[PDB]
């Protein structure tokens, strides 16, 4: 179970050489599933000695409807006020 | 096992107590349903076992 490619490929002991020395190629060890990134932006800057990994995470994705509804009340009241103001004037 | 003994754990797992309790409950429910399925299979296959 790997998240980063530099950790994935650093010291891998499940290489075909060893697995052929045992000759047992399990399906759960497919390299298609071994590594997968975090789906959050992660770029590289230059630190003091080497590359530094900086993650850019902007907004959450687990918002529920109650947050959306409570954050919309001022907008709805502004719409009501503007429409009634247009009607009166 | 030897590697974990020499170097210890990578770190602690950030979990919720609700999810912890629910994982334990799910394991117990899975064991209970496996036992029920075993009994049902034994009764169904009685004429062949």
């Amino acid at each position: 179970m790997f998240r980063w490619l530099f950790l994935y490929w650093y010291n891998s002991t499940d290489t075909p050489s060893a697995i052929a020395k045992v000759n047992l190629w399990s399906y759960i060890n497919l390299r298609l599933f071994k590594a997968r990134l975090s789906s959050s932006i992660a770029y590289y800057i230059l630190g003091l000695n080497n590359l530094e990994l900086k993650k850019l995470k902007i907004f959450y994705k687990n918002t529920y409807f109650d947050y959306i509804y409570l954050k919309s009340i001022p907008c709805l009241f502004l719409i009501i006020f503007f429409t009634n103001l247009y009607l009166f004037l | 096992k030897q590697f974990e003994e020499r170097y210890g754990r990578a770190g602690q797992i950030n979990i919720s107590k609700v999810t912890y309790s629910t994982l334990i409950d799910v394991e117990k429910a899975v064991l209970k349903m496996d036992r029920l399925f075993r009994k049902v299979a034994k009764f169904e296959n009685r004429a062949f076992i």
Binding site: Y44, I45, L46, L48, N49, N50, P74 | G11, Q12
Partner: protein, 384 residues
């Protein structure tokens, strides 16, 4: 003269890169977020400042035990005579839920001794509208009422009466003094308050903080949320109040903190005081007490670059310069990048802007060959 220590700081560990089981701190820490011990060595006085949110039974029992065993020479409770009468007429109540059942009756203690004149009626209308708006923005449930005193104050007063020690009532959050102070400031307006309160969370940070704070209040009850309110959360709440209404925050928090400090420092019997005040006055009272009695924790000077490892940067630069010179001499060429490690901010990988570092002003400039392999000897020696 002025000791400009930090008073209301809610940002905890901004130098850690926290997250994913590596938290910035623990917020539960019960029995310690609430009680503070302060000393006045000049007069040999001891103060036990208890900041209550008036919502937890556990903290009420701890305060009762503290008053029982400490035996102070004075108890300073942040209530008034009307509330004390109402609460002393209430008996056989030992849990905070039962007292929460009387929340309206205890809220009757908020009595304003105002006139019936036209100006006072206009002020009453404005103040009630502003209170309604600020309670809409505060949004606390029934079981969490930090401004309606509960079992902690009642137990403190009863245990003070049992020991026959004087009790000093400091008044509720909105008392006659603060009511007159709000009368002086004409900045009360429900509509402007709504507009400014829907603009308080001007960046994502505050918004997020807001969410999780109230999120916890929605999951854990008032009793479980009173225990998990530490100094950082209290300071965040006072700053949120400041963003909602800076003038009323100045009147209700800062000025009342100064008044409570005055009362606790001078208008008290002394030599042992147990002061059960509201939760968010503890930072200001503690800061004022420490500044007046000079009992501040020792200063540990913070150099802005104290945590900067300049040696790491300079060693990396030197190592990469030596490596560039060595590789250029081996290959009989010159460096291609002069950037130690390749990152895409300059777009020099695919554009025409090089990162070559060769600067000199004339043909006699000694620093002409700095950065080039000609600067090094065949032994890769830095000079000549």
């Amino acid at each position: 003269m002025i000791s400009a220590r930090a008073v209301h700081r809610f940002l905890r560990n901004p130098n850690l890169e926290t997250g994913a089981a590596f938290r910035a701190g623990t917020r539960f820490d019960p029995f310690k977020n609430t009680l503070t011990v302060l000393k006045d060595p000049q007069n040999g006085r001891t103060l036990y400042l208890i900041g209550t949110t008036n919502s937890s039974t556990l903290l009420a029992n701890r305060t009762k035990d503290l008053v029982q065993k400490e035996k102070p020479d004075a108890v300073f409770v942040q209530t008034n005579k009307e509330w004390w009468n109402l609460a002393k007429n209430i008996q056989d109540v030992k849990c905070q839920q039962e007292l929460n059942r009387y929340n309206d009756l205890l809220s009757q203690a908020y009595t304003l001794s105002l006139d019936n004149t036209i100006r006072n009626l206009v002020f009453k209308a404005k103040f009630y509208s502003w209170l309604f708006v600020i309670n809409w923005f505060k949004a606390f449930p029934d079981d969490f009422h930090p401004f309606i005193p509960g079992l902690e104050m009642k137990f403190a007063i009863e245990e003070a009466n049992k020991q026959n020690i004087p009790v000093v009532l400091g008044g509720l959050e909105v008392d006659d003094v603060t009511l007159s102070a709000l009368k002086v400031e004409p900045r009360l307006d429900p509509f402007s308050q709504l507009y400014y309160g829907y603009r308080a969370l001007h960046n994502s940070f505050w918004r997020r903080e807001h969410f999780d704070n109230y999120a916890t209040l929605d999951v854990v009850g008032g009793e479980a949320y009173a225990e998990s309110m530490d100094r950082f959360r209290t300071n965040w709440f006072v700053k949120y109040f400041e963003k909602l209404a800076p003038y009323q925050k100045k009147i209700i928090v800062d000025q009342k903190d100064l008044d409570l400090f005055y009362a606790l420092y001078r208008d008290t019997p002394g030599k042992k005081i147990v002061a059960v005040v509201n939760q968010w006055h503890v930072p200001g009272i503690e800061n004022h007490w420490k500044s007046a009695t000079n009992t501040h924790e020792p200063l540990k000077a913070i150099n802005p670059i104290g945590d900067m490892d300049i040696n790491k940067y300079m060693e990396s630069q030197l190592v990469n310069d030596t490596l560039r010179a060595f590789v250029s001499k081996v290959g009989k060429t010159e460096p291609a990048t002069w950037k130690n490690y390749s990152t895409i901010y300059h777009k020099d990988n695919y554009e025409a802007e090089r990162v070559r570092h060769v600067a000199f002003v004339d043909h006699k400039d000694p620093h002409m060959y700095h950065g080039l392999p000609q600067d090094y000897d065949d032994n890769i020696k830095p000079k000549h």
